[PDB]
Amino acid sequence: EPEWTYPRLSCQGSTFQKALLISPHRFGEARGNSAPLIIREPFIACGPKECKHFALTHYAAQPGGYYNGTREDRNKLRHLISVKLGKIPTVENSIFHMAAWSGSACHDGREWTYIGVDGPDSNALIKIKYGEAYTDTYHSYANNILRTQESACNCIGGDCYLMITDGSASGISKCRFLKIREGRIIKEIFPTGRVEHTEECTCGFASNKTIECACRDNSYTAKRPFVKLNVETDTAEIRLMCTETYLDTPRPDDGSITGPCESNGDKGRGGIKGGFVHQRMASKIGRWYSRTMSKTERMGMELYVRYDGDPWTDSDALAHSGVMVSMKEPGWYSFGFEIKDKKCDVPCIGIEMVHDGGKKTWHSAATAIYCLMGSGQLLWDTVTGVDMAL
Amino acid sequence: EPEWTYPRLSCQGSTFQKALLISPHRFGEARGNSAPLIIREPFIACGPKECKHFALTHYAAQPGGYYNGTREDRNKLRHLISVKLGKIPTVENSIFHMAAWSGSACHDGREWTYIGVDGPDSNALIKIKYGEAYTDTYHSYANNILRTQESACNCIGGDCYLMITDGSASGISKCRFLKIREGRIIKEIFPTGRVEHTEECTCGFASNKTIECACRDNSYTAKRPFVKLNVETDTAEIRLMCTETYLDTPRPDDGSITGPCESNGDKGRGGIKGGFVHQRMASKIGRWYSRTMSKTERMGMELYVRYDGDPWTDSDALAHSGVMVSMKEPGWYSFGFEIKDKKCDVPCIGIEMVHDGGKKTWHSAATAIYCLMGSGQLLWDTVTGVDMAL
Amino acid sequence: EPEWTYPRLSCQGSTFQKALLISPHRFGEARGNSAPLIIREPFIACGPKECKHFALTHYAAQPGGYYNGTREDRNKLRHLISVKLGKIPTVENSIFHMAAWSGSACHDGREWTYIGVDGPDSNALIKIKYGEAYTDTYHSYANNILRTQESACNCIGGDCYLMITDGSASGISKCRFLKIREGRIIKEIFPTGRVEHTEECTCGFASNKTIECACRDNSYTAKRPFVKLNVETDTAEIRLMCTETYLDTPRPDDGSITGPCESNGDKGRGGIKGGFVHQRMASKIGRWYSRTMSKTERMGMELYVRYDGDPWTDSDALAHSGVMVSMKEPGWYSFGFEIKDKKCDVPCIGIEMVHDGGKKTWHSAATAIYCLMGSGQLLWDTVTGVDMAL
Amino acid sequence: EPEWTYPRLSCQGSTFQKALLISPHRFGEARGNSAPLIIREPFIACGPKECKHFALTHYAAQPGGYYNGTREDRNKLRHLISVKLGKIPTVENSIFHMAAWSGSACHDGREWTYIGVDGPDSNALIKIKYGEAYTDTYHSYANNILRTQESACNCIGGDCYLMITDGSASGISKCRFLKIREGRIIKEIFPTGRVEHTEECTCGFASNKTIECACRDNSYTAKRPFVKLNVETDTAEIRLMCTETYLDTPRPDDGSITGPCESNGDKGRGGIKGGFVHQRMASKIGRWYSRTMSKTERMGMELYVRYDGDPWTDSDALAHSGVMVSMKEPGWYSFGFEIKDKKCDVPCIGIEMVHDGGKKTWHSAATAIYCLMGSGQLLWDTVTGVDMAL
Ligand SMILES: CC(=O)N[C@H]1[C@H]([C@H](O)[C@H](O)CO)OC(C(=O)O)=C[C@@H]1O
Ligand SMILES: CC(=O)N[C@H]1[C@H]([C@H](O)[C@H](O)CO)OC(C(=O)O)=C[C@@H]1O
Ligand SMILES: CC(=O)N[C@H]1[C@H]([C@H](O)[C@H](O)CO)OC(C(=O)O)=C[C@@H]1O
Ligand SMILES: CC(=O)N[C@H]1[C@H]([C@H](O)[C@H](O)CO)OC(C(=O)O)=C[C@@H]1O
Ligand SMILES: *[C@@H]1O[C@H](CO)[C@@H](O)[C@H](O)[C@H]1NC(C)=O
Ligand SMILES: *[C@@H]1O[C@H](CO)[C@@H](O)[C@H](O)[C@H]1NC(C)=O
Ligand SMILES: *[C@@H]1O[C@H](CO)[C@@H](O)[C@H](O)[C@H]1NC(C)=O
Ligand SMILES: *[C@@H]1O[C@H](CO)[C@@H](O)[C@H](O)[C@H]1NC(C)=O
Ligand SMILES: [Ca+2]
Ligand SMILES: [Ca+2]
Ligand SMILES: [Ca+2]
Ligand SMILES: [Ca+2]
Ligand SMILES: [Ca+2]
């Protein structure tokens, strides 16, 4: 039957370029004839032959009559959906996988694992699907909105690896990692180190031995919690990224947090899920990251790179690698993912571009994608082209 | 070729949890751009790779101009349709299998058998289709609305079993079982025992030797007729369920029916198709059941379980195992089905949540799905989210 | 690679029953959200695993703005389209095969052959497609609307067989048969016998040696031209059906044409394509036919059968086998086709039910299907359920 | 694996005939229910089993609210999209391949290569994708709207060739050819000869050793630049076509350009992409070409052919071979492509028929297809049937 997937060396290239924009609300005009789904938290995950574009829908379309409440994060109607990457997630193109207000999914080389969380806030539930079958669940351990990545889980040799977290969005939220094989949790991994608050980890393989994640600390800092998870020992350690180029939003000016790598600094409250993807070369490792152009608002999105070093000890500024979204455009969640070419993996960053008109109208998002290709500098930015009044 | 399906041991787990809501009319607003079909009697049946969500459509969409008559049960337009489970059943997503106002379907491991009943009330006709080909029929034996399950039929080693019945809705309706192989009736089974009214049986495998069904008595009792069909001998016997937890609607208060297990009791007229599925373990069998929260109306739905014992003689109350649909929400027909995982079968109960605004507007239904998933207790309920005025 | 298809013995059964109604305009309401295509001349043809539902579209949808001219038969916009049988031929479900205002198609066991005719009336052109590729053409020989069957062609061992005709609709139109293999015309067959006018032949296999067709004579008679085509010698002979049950519309009363089988009789001018399908048993042959209930109008449709005999010499009345469409409903073109079960062929008759409101509105049709299944008598009729004002 | 594609001898035939019209806006009326995408620069490319119809969309549908700017050629929203040939390119039928305002694509026998150009005018970028993976880029060399073919690239034995150009629309635009294998540029070919302005080349195989292209000169001449690229040596030479039948638009009267074959002539400013395809026979090669009926406007389209000779030195008029589009109808870009039959290749010419109502309304296009089919002469023309006011 198919081989299990492993991370491979990345395809050759030294810059990212604009790849693709999925802007479903370019067709949502009241005079139009389409039914784009209202969604937020999009992410992409690829198998050997295909990529799926996932999101959490509010189970409502534009145009339609169910806009009220689409700016809320959790309720009894949100579902995890997907379409083949390159299709436009409408009512008929999408597949509804499970009721969920937090999600993840990944392919292990043989089948898709789908993860969704739902249940009441004080006692939510991780639910796992392998293909068509519901196979396992995991309980709330801190009884305060158990939740997961909002981006792809990561499989190697049939073992997938997922961050989950539970606890207060303004206080302690210690994450755990689940090791899942054929839809069933075979190991729970309790991290060591700086564990006070880790959520929405964007994870990827640095090698066949290590999974790394750049996460969100919604409570204490604008520096991102950076997980190193050893896949051979199933152990994990977390420490704050030490770079002066703070990747969260909100954040203080770069380099303004004085003290050791561990100092939390200022404007720590609040956060945003950030993009992070690995470029694995024979001798070296590129870590590519994204952050908003604004320090305080979810506007714009810029690309940054650092080759090698130790993200927990390196204070060096990340190298600015191009404007993906200008400050005039929305820049909300961003995530890494990798496309499987024939012999090598292609690193990409996807950007959630939310159309926000506040609670009195529909709330949904476009997804912009940039991927490593060729050499040079990043050339063009992305606009959604959507007028929310139509 | 592919080999034939057999029931396997159920996947590990001890509670049901909210899996999926298919609510097509969340997209049926007059100002929206979708075409959900108007349906009732949904059910799901799965083969080794995928599941199909079936329903009997009135051959009309919302928004549309044919809402009159969609609250009738039988006419010349109703058709059995399906979509792959997970898709919204719209005009374009759906497949129209055959003209029918009562239906069933099941997969034997190699192909789908589809079953539909249409024809005049005094002379209806069972029609069987195997894949694309129409292969056989069975005639009315009591000339009073020949009808079938409204849920999956069941196949073992190539032989599929189906309940059919015929007779008065408020009098005698003696069912029979047809044994069907590659779309042709190879045997008729005439049940013995308590036989005066059995309809809409929800059937599943208790083992490789026994099919059991929890049925509806629309005339005489609020107890469900419980069929035990021996697959090795092709003989069936029926007796009423003796549990004090009466599963029909309408029903008297639990435990108020005095006298031996077979006593009919009061409030027997009327009925509802009920959910029933098996959890097969090595040394134990769980029988999961659903019934409305309201004793007299199709409102709410809760789950019950009992392990082992004999349904025909056990008077004990079933164990309440969670509220799937609150009193506030519609709880109409429910049904069991099993999803095939790699090595084990996952039992589920689906619930038809009818949008009933009376005879003056459209009448259709959402389908909610709960499956055996991990451990603990059932955590959340399902709402349709539909405002019928839009 | 796949085996070539051959006709097999028909599946067991002795009556036809209502199978399926495809009524695309049940969704064409101005307040609805669907795009059913405007079409006429539907027909169905099946391969080993699937059937396609073909029609000639006017390249316009309901609701829409291009109704004017949809009651005309030939123009530069008509195209041959198809969908999988059981889907609803809308703008997005359909596939456009080629520009055509007359068509046919069949599967040879390996690939689909598509035939369409277009060009000016005085010099039209047969065009042949095998799969995706355009492979051959045939010229007009009488320069008066070269045209073909409007129903399936018939393949045996890779050789397909198609009727074409050319000439005046009110005078002589001598047909020819094309023998096509892998999309290319390998033989032209000139019939003998009564050849003055033959068009719209509905053809099928009576055995591996003979193809038979019941055709339309638009000029001279209400008796149908009946072709016997020997597949081993590639020769064909045509004579009028001798039965007193005249199958054309318009027609005189049954049995009123006195004289030998060859007498044309009265009300010969005008015609309609009629259904005809074979039931091949080990020792005997059933010939099933359809005709309108009205003698003069395209209203209603009745089924008739005759086992064995010689249609060219037998004066015997055909046995009435049931009302498929009542006189209150439209009954326009009808055609035979066969569905491939596992070991045997299932004969069916499809009926074009046109929604005709004259030239000031849209003109299109539903397709009703009846197939041989089980024993007894035909039980229920078909209505389109369409109100042309919505 | 699958083996690589090579050009084969063309299928037998001697005239082209009307094959297929894809006219998406026949379904775009404000009162209809469809969503045809607004596109320009359609082209078709085929692999062994299927063909894809590509176009550059403005990421907008009709009816819709984003008609402004759909008459511009380049912006941040244009995307290369495709549907399987035969499908209508709507919002849901289409696949969005990549952000691009100039494109190309071709199949090498194992996978699709997709090519798109986007980026600022002064610094655009060729992006290549192989299946799902983004694999390579090529930068602007003259910093003035780097651009490519708007028609299929061409693969032989795994190596695909593509024309690119860069430079002034009204001055020097020296093209180059890229040789691409599994999505990566393995060679750049710098043509020799008459090189001052070559763009929008329509290229195909004259044999296994030569690719020829008929191109556009937007600055200096109404003669088409004609490329001969030697696949064995990866060298290319360009000279102007010497035929008195000038194929560009605008153009002077046929045969009015005095002096040697290379003379530029008058009315050289402006241009149009032109149809060109090869018919390869054992001892003879036919070169089929299309040009507008009007000498100065994009109206009408007729077909021409010449067998053998050398385009660079032959002054002879080409043979008029039929009117594909009347003067009455729009005739904009045209392109060649070949469909793969079982044993031979079918040459076709497709025509973009733009709906131009000026800058105040939507601007999009229908695609008409003519292919080599049987013998005789071309019989009918194509109309779009679209009323732009609906
Ligand atoms: C499970 C859940 O509610 N996730 C929400 C998340 C959460 O509130 C925060 O991460 C603190 O824990 O925040 C956001 C947000 O746009 O910022 C959207 C997510 O839907
Ligand atoms: C074949 C048929 O009519 N089935 C109908 C069934 C029947 O009336 C009853 O089971 C008595 O026989 O009842 C109901 C119902 O909602 O209660 C709906 C079904 O469509
Ligand atoms: C090719 C063509 O025009 N076919 C037309 C056919 C023809 O006019 C007649 O068969 C005389 O030849 O008649 C009819 C009709 O409903 O009666 C519809 C067909 O579209
Ligand atoms: C890349 C680009 O802009 N292409 C445009 C092209 C270009 O302007 C000309 O070929 C001079 O270079 O012209 C046209 C045109 O309809 O004539 C449409 C193309 O979209
Ligand atoms: C990871 O391991 C697999 C075999 O297990 C190997 O083929 C692959 O190239 C390795 N990837 C990296 C990044 O070293
Ligand atoms: C049923 O029978 C098959 C073999 O016929 C066996 O593989 C399967 O495990 C059995 N299932 C149960 C529940 O006994
Ligand atoms: C026709 O011939 C094939 C073999 O060529 C045979 O299998 C089939 O059964 C025959 N059909 C009939 C109707 O005799
Ligand atoms: C091209 O080359 C292949 C073998 O490489 C051959 O099969 C094919 O027929 C050749 N085509 C032409 C036009 O010569
Ligand atoms: Ca659709
Ligand atoms: Ca923070
Ligand atoms: Ca009852
Ligand atoms: Ca006649
Ligand atoms: Ca020019």
Side-chain angles (χ1 to χ4, degrees), chain C residues 335-355:
Chain C
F335 51 84
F337 69 97
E338 305 189 25
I339 305 168
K340 293 278 173 186
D341 187 21
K342 276 51 182 63
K343 302 141 195 100
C344 54
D345 295 346
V346 179
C348 304
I349 279 184
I351 305 152
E352 175 190 47
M353 292 181 85
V354 171
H355 309 298

PDB file of all heavy atoms in Angstrom, chain C residues 335-355:
ATOM      1  N   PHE C 335     -37.656   6.228 -26.876  1.00  0.00           N
ATOM      2  CA  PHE C 335     -36.474   5.546 -27.409  1.00  0.00           C
ATOM      3  C   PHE C 335     -36.192   4.328 -26.544  1.00  0.00           C
ATOM      4  O   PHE C 335     -36.600   4.269 -25.377  1.00  0.00           O
ATOM      5  CB  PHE C 335     -35.275   6.535 -27.389  1.00  0.00           C
ATOM      6  CG  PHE C 335     -35.025   7.233 -26.037  1.00  0.00           C
ATOM      7  CD1 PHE C 335     -34.284   6.601 -25.046  1.00  0.00           C
ATOM      8  CD2 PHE C 335     -35.591   8.472 -25.784  1.00  0.00           C
ATOM      9  CE1 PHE C 335     -34.114   7.177 -23.805  1.00  0.00           C
ATOM     10  CE2 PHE C 335     -35.415   9.053 -24.541  1.00  0.00           C
ATOM     11  CZ  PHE C 335     -34.680   8.402 -23.558  1.00  0.00           C
ATOM     12  N   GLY C 336     -35.534   3.332 -27.095  1.00  0.00           N
ATOM     13  CA  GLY C 336     -35.159   2.182 -26.299  1.00  0.00           C
ATOM     14  C   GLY C 336     -33.714   2.335 -25.888  1.00  0.00           C
ATOM     15  O   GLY C 336     -32.943   3.093 -26.519  1.00  0.00           O
ATOM     16  N   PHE C 337     -33.333   1.670 -24.808  1.00  0.00           N
ATOM     17  CA  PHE C 337     -31.924   1.552 -24.468  1.00  0.00           C
ATOM     18  C   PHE C 337     -31.780   0.386 -23.493  1.00  0.00           C
ATOM     19  O   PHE C 337     -32.783  -0.087 -22.951  1.00  0.00           O
ATOM     20  CB  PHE C 337     -31.375   2.854 -23.836  1.00  0.00           C
ATOM     21  CG  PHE C 337     -31.867   3.225 -22.433  1.00  0.00           C
ATOM     22  CD1 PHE C 337     -31.073   2.886 -21.341  1.00  0.00           C
ATOM     23  CD2 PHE C 337     -33.084   3.881 -22.268  1.00  0.00           C
ATOM     24  CE1 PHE C 337     -31.511   3.212 -20.073  1.00  0.00           C
ATOM     25  CE2 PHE C 337     -33.521   4.208 -20.995  1.00  0.00           C
ATOM     26  CZ  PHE C 337     -32.735   3.876 -19.900  1.00  0.00           C
ATOM     27  N   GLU C 338     -30.576  -0.117 -23.260  1.00  0.00           N
ATOM     28  CA  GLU C 338     -30.361  -1.270 -22.390  1.00  0.00           C
ATOM     29  C   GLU C 338     -29.268  -0.948 -21.395  1.00  0.00           C
ATOM     30  O   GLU C 338     -28.254  -0.323 -21.753  1.00  0.00           O
ATOM     31  CB  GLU C 338     -29.943  -2.462 -23.217  1.00  0.00           C
ATOM     32  CG  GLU C 338     -30.963  -2.773 -24.334  1.00  0.00           C
ATOM     33  CD  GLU C 338     -30.739  -4.089 -25.072  1.00  0.00           C
ATOM     34  OE1 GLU C 338     -30.155  -5.002 -24.527  1.00  0.00           O
ATOM     35  OE2 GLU C 338     -31.170  -4.278 -26.195  1.00  0.00           O
ATOM     36  N   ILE C 339     -29.510  -1.327 -20.142  1.00  0.00           N
ATOM     37  CA  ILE C 339     -28.575  -1.133 -19.045  1.00  0.00           C
ATOM     38  C   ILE C 339     -27.888  -2.469 -18.848  1.00  0.00           C
ATOM     39  O   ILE C 339     -28.518  -3.545 -18.916  1.00  0.00           O
ATOM     40  CB  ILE C 339     -29.305  -0.727 -17.716  1.00  0.00           C
ATOM     41  CG1 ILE C 339     -30.194   0.507 -17.872  1.00  0.00           C
ATOM     42  CG2 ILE C 339     -28.208  -0.424 -16.681  1.00  0.00           C
ATOM     43  CD1 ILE C 339     -31.145   0.771 -16.683  1.00  0.00           C
ATOM     44  N   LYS C 340     -26.587  -2.426 -18.617  1.00  0.00           N
ATOM     45  CA  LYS C 340     -25.790  -3.635 -18.461  1.00  0.00           C
ATOM     46  C   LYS C 340     -25.792  -4.063 -16.980  1.00  0.00           C
ATOM     47  O   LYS C 340     -25.211  -3.386 -16.095  1.00  0.00           O
ATOM     48  CB  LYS C 340     -24.359  -3.317 -18.984  1.00  0.00           C
ATOM     49  CG  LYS C 340     -24.266  -3.046 -20.526  1.00  0.00           C
ATOM     50  CD  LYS C 340     -24.205  -4.394 -21.282  1.00  0.00           C
ATOM     51  CE  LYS C 340     -24.254  -4.526 -22.821  1.00  0.00           C
ATOM     52  NZ  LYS C 340     -24.327  -5.937 -23.247  1.00  0.00           N
ATOM     53  N   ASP C 341     -26.513  -5.143 -16.640  1.00  0.00           N
ATOM     54  CA  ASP C 341     -26.345  -5.706 -15.292  1.00  0.00           C
ATOM     55  C   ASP C 341     -25.084  -6.592 -15.376  1.00  0.00           C
ATOM     56  O   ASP C 341     -24.434  -6.688 -16.441  1.00  0.00           O
ATOM     57  CB  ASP C 341     -27.582  -6.540 -14.914  1.00  0.00           C
ATOM     58  CG  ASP C 341     -27.648  -7.063 -13.479  1.00  0.00           C
ATOM     59  OD1 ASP C 341     -26.990  -6.551 -12.576  1.00  0.00           O
ATOM     60  OD2 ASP C 341     -28.351  -8.050 -13.260  1.00  0.00           O
ATOM     61  N   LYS C 342     -24.722  -7.305 -14.313  1.00  0.00           N
ATOM     62  CA  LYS C 342     -23.527  -8.130 -14.235  1.00  0.00           C
ATOM     63  C   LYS C 342     -23.437  -9.212 -15.292  1.00  0.00           C
ATOM     64  O   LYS C 342     -22.412  -9.349 -15.987  1.00  0.00           O
ATOM     65  CB  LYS C 342     -23.449  -8.759 -12.835  1.00  0.00           C
ATOM     66  CG  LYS C 342     -22.811  -7.923 -11.695  1.00  0.00           C
ATOM     67  CD  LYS C 342     -23.387  -6.516 -11.553  1.00  0.00           C
ATOM     68  CE  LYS C 342     -22.816  -5.573 -10.485  1.00  0.00           C
ATOM     69  NZ  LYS C 342     -21.424  -5.204 -10.634  1.00  0.00           N
ATOM     70  N   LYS C 343     -24.531  -9.945 -15.474  1.00  0.00           N
ATOM     71  CA  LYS C 343     -24.536 -11.076 -16.383  1.00  0.00           C
ATOM     72  C   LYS C 343     -25.585 -10.914 -17.464  1.00  0.00           C
ATOM     73  O   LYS C 343     -25.584 -11.733 -18.362  1.00  0.00           O
ATOM     74  CB  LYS C 343     -24.796 -12.363 -15.569  1.00  0.00           C
ATOM     75  CG  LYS C 343     -23.747 -12.574 -14.479  1.00  0.00           C
ATOM     76  CD  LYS C 343     -24.353 -13.114 -13.169  1.00  0.00           C
ATOM     77  CE  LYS C 343     -23.369 -12.967 -11.962  1.00  0.00           C
ATOM     78  NZ  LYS C 343     -23.567 -11.843 -11.024  1.00  0.00           N
ATOM     79  N   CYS C 344     -26.434  -9.881 -17.504  1.00  0.00           N
ATOM     80  CA  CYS C 344     -27.527  -9.795 -18.453  1.00  0.00           C
ATOM     81  C   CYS C 344     -27.888  -8.333 -18.698  1.00  0.00           C
ATOM     82  O   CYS C 344     -27.441  -7.435 -17.959  1.00  0.00           O
ATOM     83  CB  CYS C 344     -28.739 -10.578 -17.891  1.00  0.00           C
ATOM     84  SG  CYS C 344     -29.214 -10.037 -16.208  1.00  0.00           S
ATOM     85  N   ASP C 345     -28.630  -8.089 -19.777  1.00  0.00           N
ATOM     86  CA  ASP C 345     -29.008  -6.754 -20.190  1.00  0.00           C
ATOM     87  C   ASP C 345     -30.432  -6.410 -19.788  1.00  0.00           C
ATOM     88  O   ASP C 345     -31.344  -7.248 -19.892  1.00  0.00           O
ATOM     89  CB  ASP C 345     -28.815  -6.667 -21.712  1.00  0.00           C
ATOM     90  CG  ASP C 345     -27.356  -6.812 -22.143  1.00  0.00           C
ATOM     91  OD1 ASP C 345     -26.419  -6.735 -21.353  1.00  0.00           O
ATOM     92  OD2 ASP C 345     -27.101  -7.021 -23.322  1.00  0.00           O
ATOM     93  N   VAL C 346     -30.669  -5.173 -19.342  1.00  0.00           N
ATOM     94  CA  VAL C 346     -31.977  -4.751 -18.845  1.00  0.00           C
ATOM     95  C   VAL C 346     -32.532  -3.779 -19.878  1.00  0.00           C
ATOM     96  O   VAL C 346     -31.955  -2.683 -20.024  1.00  0.00           O
ATOM     97  CB  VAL C 346     -31.885  -4.014 -17.482  1.00  0.00           C
ATOM     98  CG1 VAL C 346     -33.305  -3.580 -17.063  1.00  0.00           C
ATOM     99  CG2 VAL C 346     -31.263  -4.933 -16.403  1.00  0.00           C
ATOM    100  N   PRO C 347     -33.587  -4.154 -20.601  1.00  0.00           N
ATOM    101  CA  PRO C 347     -34.291  -3.295 -21.573  1.00  0.00           C
ATOM    102  C   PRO C 347     -35.123  -2.190 -20.925  1.00  0.00           C
ATOM    103  O   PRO C 347     -35.861  -2.432 -19.952  1.00  0.00           O
ATOM    104  CB  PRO C 347     -35.134  -4.251 -22.381  1.00  0.00           C
ATOM    105  CG  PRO C 347     -35.415  -5.406 -21.461  1.00  0.00           C
ATOM    106  CD  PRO C 347     -34.136  -5.515 -20.626  1.00  0.00           C
ATOM    107  N   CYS C 348     -35.018  -0.965 -21.436  1.00  0.00           N
ATOM    108  CA  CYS C 348     -35.782   0.159 -20.928  1.00  0.00           C
ATOM    109  C   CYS C 348     -36.298   0.993 -22.105  1.00  0.00           C
ATOM    110  O   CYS C 348     -35.738   0.942 -23.212  1.00  0.00           O
ATOM    111  CB  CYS C 348     -34.912   1.069 -20.100  1.00  0.00           C
ATOM    112  SG  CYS C 348     -34.060   0.270 -18.734  1.00  0.00           S
ATOM    113  N   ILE C 349     -37.338   1.774 -21.838  1.00  0.00           N
ATOM    114  CA  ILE C 349     -37.857   2.733 -22.777  1.00  0.00           C
ATOM    115  C   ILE C 349     -37.837   4.059 -22.025  1.00  0.00           C
ATOM    116  O   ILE C 349     -38.234   4.138 -20.842  1.00  0.00           O
ATOM    117  CB  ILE C 349     -39.297   2.357 -23.225  1.00  0.00           C
ATOM    118  CG1 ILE C 349     -39.130   1.287 -24.314  1.00  0.00           C
ATOM    119  CG2 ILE C 349     -40.092   3.574 -23.762  1.00  0.00           C
ATOM    120  CD1 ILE C 349     -40.376   0.762 -25.056  1.00  0.00           C
ATOM    121  N   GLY C 350     -37.293   5.078 -22.689  1.00  0.00           N
ATOM    122  CA  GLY C 350     -37.293   6.421 -22.138  1.00  0.00           C
ATOM    123  C   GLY C 350     -38.297   7.265 -22.935  1.00  0.00           C
ATOM    124  O   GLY C 350     -38.507   7.015 -24.127  1.00  0.00           O
ATOM    125  N   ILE C 351     -38.928   8.261 -22.327  1.00  0.00           N
ATOM    126  CA  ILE C 351     -39.960   9.075 -22.943  1.00  0.00           C
ATOM    127  C   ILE C 351     -39.576  10.538 -22.766  1.00  0.00           C
ATOM    128  O   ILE C 351     -39.367  10.990 -21.623  1.00  0.00           O
ATOM    129  CB  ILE C 351     -41.307   8.789 -22.249  1.00  0.00           C
ATOM    130  CG1 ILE C 351     -41.635   7.286 -22.290  1.00  0.00           C
ATOM    131  CG2 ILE C 351     -42.411   9.602 -22.928  1.00  0.00           C
ATOM    132  CD1 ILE C 351     -42.502   7.012 -21.057  1.00  0.00           C
ATOM    133  N   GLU C 352     -39.553  11.290 -23.861  1.00  0.00           N
ATOM    134  CA  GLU C 352     -39.346  12.726 -23.855  1.00  0.00           C
ATOM    135  C   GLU C 352     -40.699  13.335 -23.514  1.00  0.00           C
ATOM    136  O   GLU C 352     -41.695  13.069 -24.184  1.00  0.00           O
ATOM    137  CB  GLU C 352     -38.897  13.211 -25.233  1.00  0.00           C
ATOM    138  CG  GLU C 352     -38.769  14.728 -25.322  1.00  0.00           C
ATOM    139  CD  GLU C 352     -38.553  15.241 -26.736  1.00  0.00           C
ATOM    140  OE1 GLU C 352     -39.235  14.840 -27.668  1.00  0.00           O
ATOM    141  OE2 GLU C 352     -37.705  16.097 -26.940  1.00  0.00           O
ATOM    142  N   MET C 353     -40.814  14.183 -22.483  1.00  0.00           N
ATOM    143  CA  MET C 353     -42.086  14.767 -22.067  1.00  0.00           C
ATOM    144  C   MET C 353     -41.839  16.259 -22.240  1.00  0.00           C
ATOM    145  O   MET C 353     -41.263  16.913 -21.367  1.00  0.00           O
ATOM    146  CB  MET C 353     -42.354  14.378 -20.602  1.00  0.00           C
ATOM    147  CG  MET C 353     -42.620  12.856 -20.444  1.00  0.00           C
ATOM    148  SD  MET C 353     -42.958  12.396 -18.725  1.00  0.00           S
ATOM    149  CE  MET C 353     -44.709  12.724 -18.614  1.00  0.00           C
ATOM    150  N   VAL C 354     -42.205  16.829 -23.379  1.00  0.00           N
ATOM    151  CA  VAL C 354     -41.909  18.223 -23.651  1.00  0.00           C
ATOM    152  C   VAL C 354     -42.830  19.190 -22.950  1.00  0.00           C
ATOM    153  O   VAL C 354     -44.038  18.921 -22.875  1.00  0.00           O
ATOM    154  CB  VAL C 354     -41.960  18.468 -25.196  1.00  0.00           C
ATOM    155  CG1 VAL C 354     -41.887  19.962 -25.554  1.00  0.00           C
ATOM    156  CG2 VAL C 354     -40.744  17.783 -25.835  1.00  0.00           C
ATOM    157  N   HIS C 355     -42.300  20.311 -22.427  1.00  0.00           N
ATOM    158  CA  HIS C 355     -43.097  21.370 -21.832  1.00  0.00           C
ATOM    159  C   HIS C 355     -43.276  22.336 -22.989  1.00  0.00           C
ATOM    160  O   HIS C 355     -42.336  23.022 -23.400  1.00  0.00           O
ATOM    161  CB  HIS C 355     -42.361  22.079 -20.709  1.00  0.00           C
ATOM    162  CG  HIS C 355     -41.794  21.099 -19.686  1.00  0.00           C
ATOM    163  ND1 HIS C 355     -42.496  20.272 -18.949  1.00  0.00           N
ATOM    164  CD2 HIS C 355     -40.470  20.898 -19.399  1.00  0.00           C
ATOM    165  CE1 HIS C 355     -41.655  19.562 -18.231  1.00  0.00           C
ATOM    166  NE2 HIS C 355     -40.426  19.946 -18.506  1.00  0.00           N
TER     167      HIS C 355
END
